[PDB]
Ligand binder design. Structure first.
Ligand SMILES: CCCCCCCCCCCC
Length: 162
């Protein structure tokens, strides 16, 4: 109940493949602040299952290394919303995608909204896609975002973005 965009007609099987987290933004600086921040996740691959869940492979700096992660987000009745499993009732919404060049997703908590929201602009290749960043930046003005990170091709090709 804070992300007012959601993609109609999502073919979740088609968003499979490798992805780059070109940009990311959050509702609070603490979430994207340092390399070991909570929602500073770098996405590598998206893996839908035949039943319809979504397996995410990502990287995240943690105990001071760059560690791979495996996260699986489960199907709901709304084709563009998935539930990741943790202590908290946390939700993934696919905002938009042409399957071939970009995907915009946000990641909010059930809990308290301005305390939750993180969004990313995924692109298929290590290239700065301006119109991808246009749609990401325009889906995001209707949100209360306070920190915006953005990465360049050289960082897009290195573990944890340098
Ligand atoms: C540590 C919990 C955050 C991981 C969430 C990753 C969400 C990426 C899914 C992209 C949706 C198509």
């Amino acid at each position: 109940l804070i992300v007012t965009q959601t993609m109609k007609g999502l073919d979740i099987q088609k968003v499979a493949g490798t992805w780059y987290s070109l940009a990311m933004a959050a509702s609070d600086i603490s979430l994207l602040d340092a390399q070991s921040a909570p929602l500073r996740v770098y996405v590598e691959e998206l893996k839908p299952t035949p039943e319809g869940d979504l397996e995410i492979l990502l990287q995240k700096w943690e105990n001071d290394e760059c560690a791979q992660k495996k996260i699986i987000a489960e199907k709901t009745k709304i084709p563009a919303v998935f539930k990741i499993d943790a202590l908290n009732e946390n939700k993934v919404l696919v905002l938009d995608t042409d399957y071939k060049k970009y995907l915009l997703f946000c990641m909010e908590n059930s809990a308290e909204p301005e305390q939750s929201l993180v969004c990313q602009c995924l692109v298929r290749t290590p290239e700065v896609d301006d119109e991808a960043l246009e749609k990401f930046d325009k889906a995001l003005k209707a949100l209360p975002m306070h920190i915006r990170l953005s990465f360049n091709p050289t960082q897009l090709e290195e573990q944890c973005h340098i």
